[PDB]
Write a structure and sequence with these properties.
Family: Belongs to the TonB-dependent receptor family.
CATH class: Mainly Beta
CATH architecture: Beta Barrel
Subcellular location: Cell outer membrane
Keywords: Cell outer membrane, Ion transport, Iron, Iron transport, Membrane, Receptor, Signal, TonB box, Transmembrane, Transmembrane beta strand, Transport
Number of helices: 3
Protein name: Ferric-mycobactin receptor, FemA
Membrane topology: Multi-pass membrane protein
Strand content: over 45%
Structural class: mainly beta
Distance between the termini: 32 Å
Length: 670
């Protein structure tokens, strides 16, 4: 089935299948893309709380800008920025917590590398680096009553309930509830965090009919918000990163971020060569913050913090409907999908920038004045409306008993947004566009467990508005069409798998020329090679290793200083090594270690400002034992065990690393 949960691979850390958007789930060995699915088992073993926690620790292709002390995580994949708002939910956009996705309710977190506009449409934030997909927990036939308690430096106390029950004749119905409450001081100076979460995974399992509904409520409240460090006019060197426990932003910043959503999905088998599917969901996202970005002033660590209040009221609806079928034109099997999607968003977004307070990278900021932001009080007016919707047809041609697979598709994508000024209410822009966007893949299986593949596919981003400073101010440009070519090979030796991939991704780039006209005349050309090994190559020894190399070229700019230079915030070299070891010498004891490597990178387009490479080491331990007949598991996770302080580079700013962070938990199944 297209929505069948793919099985766990050897080792139980990753799965052997992942979603290919409108196409449904495909086995890794049948997918002409680089897909990785991390399992709930990994999530629980590493005590990962967010998508960022999981992905940066295990995946060679994914690095996190922002981080858990900040209000937002974003993800660099294949040398392109991926917004947390572009994280899909069973393939649907716009239904997960906007700024940072929690995963304690997640059965799977999947990564499809590279653009994928044919498979799932444009994503709302316009990301093209890759599509992260969450699969929610479902109720197993065997009843589950799981309670865990946990502690995290410095005083975060947590409880997590995971309760699953099936009812009705033949267990047709399923109910899975996750509830988390986590509250206390974080590991960063003068920061505390409250986090309630509630989730329900409901499903109906019928003969010709499958239904599901997911409800999520989540809220993150921070006292103290870590924020980027921006480069300044006369920045000549990047100062060395402060101690990660230091908090050099606005002392009395706060965040209150709330999201709740519901999404109903279903399938109906019209015949056993035809299935209809539909989804409809909505999300409310409430945003409140006062915080400051830090800006370098001078070169020896002085900063000025620039304060801001922001408020957001965001209302999103997201739907899809379609048919999946199959027939035969002789020796060719056709597996076709016709699919339409529709996203509509109403956004109220107000902001005011006031306050410029002196500070220093190496000093936790003192209590400082909060300017009066009373004007933004009251009702949040509407400032944006967005409507995205497309129709897509795709055909997977199988021949020679599935050893050769050719997939083709085309999508017509509709993009439409309106903007309204926050103070005056005036209509400032109405962008409306449509683009066709196709794909073609070929996958050949010379050996039953060796796949070779190639794909071509595109990414779509909405065009930018020319800044208020340019000779076409406020004009909204046509959408940016990214193009991916990829080839690679996957080899599955039973207990472990090796992959390789070579890709190029080209995408237009917008800047203002010498005539002060804003145009999309730049191009980024990212070519890369990716190597991966995962699985259980020895009994009780699970390994997840990988390495990436990319040349991220600014192969078309207007300036000789940046022409042909590296895209900022994209290291050329990155690597991950994870080992999980069941000790034959203690019963129930498992030890884990991870090494995360990120090469040097640049923050500026002329590449005059380099930040160093960095290394992170995690250590973990899990102890499984019985009391009164119940299974219990005590766990420890030590992130950034060496207490390394480092900058993660981005385009014009840097995110400070998180400190050494120990988390302890006890889990009991009743």
């Amino acid at each position: 089935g297209a929505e069948t949960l793919p099985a766990e691979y050897a080792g139980g850390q990753v799965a052997r299948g992942a979603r290919l958007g409108m196409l449904g789930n495909a086995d890794v060995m049948d997918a002409p893309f680089s897909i990785t699915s991390y399992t709930a088992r990994t999530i629980e073993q590493q005590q990962a709380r967010s998508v960022a926690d999981l992905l940066q620790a295990n995946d060679p292709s994914v690095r996190v800008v922002g981080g858990r002390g900040d209000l937002v995580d974003s993800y660099t994949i294949r040398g392109f920025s991926v917004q947390n708002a572009d994280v899909a939910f069973n393939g649907l956009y716009g239904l997960l917590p906007f700024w940072r996705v929690p995963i304690e309710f997640a059965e799977r977190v999947e990564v499809l590398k590279g653009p994928n506009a044919l498979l799932g449409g444009i994503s709302p934030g316009g990301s093209v680096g890759g599509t992260i997909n969450l699969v929610p927990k479902r109720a197993d036939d065997q009843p589950l009553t799981r309670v865990s308690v946990d502690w995290t430096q410095r005083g975060q106390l947590g409880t997590h309930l995971d309760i699953g029950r099936r009812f009705g004749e033949n267990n047709a119905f399923g109910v899975r509830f996750n509830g988390v409450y986590r509250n206390g001081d974080t590991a960063v100076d003068h920061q505390s965090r409250e986090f309630p979460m509630l989730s329900l995974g409901l499903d109906f399992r019928g003969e010709r009919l499958r239904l599901s509904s997911d409800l999520l409520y989540q809220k993150e409240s921070l006292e103290g918000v870590v924020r980027p460090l921006l480069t300044g006019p006369g920045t000549t060197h990047i100062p060395h990163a402060p101690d990660s426990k230091t908090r050099f932003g606005l002392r009395d910043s706060y965040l209150d971020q709330e999201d709740y959503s519901m999404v109903n999905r279903g399938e109906y088998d019209l015949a056993d060569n035809l299935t209809a599917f539909a989804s409809i969901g909505g999300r409310q996202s409430n945003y409140e913050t006062i915080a400051a970005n830090s800006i370098l002033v001078g070169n020896q660590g002085d900063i000025v913090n620039s304060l801001a209040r922001q408020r957001g009221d965001r209302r999103t609806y997201s739907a899809e409907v379609g048919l999946r079928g199959n027939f035969d034109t002789g020796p060719l099997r056709h597996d076709w999908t016709l699919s339409a999607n529709r996203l509509h968003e109403r956004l109220g977004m107000v902001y005011a920038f006031t306050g410029m307070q002196s500070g220093n990278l190496y000093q936790t900021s003192p209590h400082t004045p909060l300017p009066d932001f009373s004007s933004l009080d009251g009702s949040i007016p509407k400032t944006n409306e967005t409507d995205l919707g497309g129709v897509a047809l795709a055909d997977r041609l199988s021949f020679l008993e599935d050893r050769v697979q050719v997939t083709l598709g085309v999508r017509r994508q509709q993009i439409e947004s309106r903007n309204y000024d926050q103070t005056s209410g005036a209509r400032t822009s109405h962008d409306k566009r449509h683009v066709w966007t196709p794909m073609a893949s070929v996958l050949v299986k010379p050996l039953q467990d060796l796949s070779l593949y190639a794909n071509y596919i595109q990414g779509l981003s909405q065009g930018e508005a020319a800044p208020m400073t340019a000779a076409n101010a406020g004009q909204v440009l046509a959408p940016y069409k990214a193009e991916q070519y990829e080839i690679g090979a996957k080899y599955d030796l039973g207990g472990f798998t090796t992959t390789l991939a070579l890709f190029e991704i080209r995408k237009p780039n917008a800047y203002t020329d010498a005539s002060n006209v804003f145009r999309a005349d730049g191009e980024q050309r990212n070519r890369g090679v990716e190597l991966s090994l995962y699985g259980e190559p020895l009994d009780g020894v699970r390994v997840m290793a990988g390495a990436t190399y990319i040349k991220p070229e600014q192969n078309k700019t207007g300036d000789p200083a940046s022409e042909g230079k590296d895209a900022p915030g994209v290291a050329r070299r990155q690597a991950n090594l994870g080992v999980s070891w069941d000790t034959p010498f203690v019963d129930g004891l498992t030890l884990d270690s991870r090494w995360i490597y990120t090469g040097s990178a640049y923050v500026d387009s002329a590449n005059a400002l380099a930040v160093p490479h960095w290394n992170r080491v995690d250590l973990g331990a899990a102890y499984a034992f019985q009391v009164a007949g119940k299974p219990l598991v005590a766990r420890a996770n030590l992130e950034n065990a060496l207490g390394k302080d480092y900058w993660t580079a981005a385009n014009g700013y840097l995110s400070i690393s998180s400190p050494r962070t120990l988390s302890l938990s006890l889990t009991a199944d009743f």
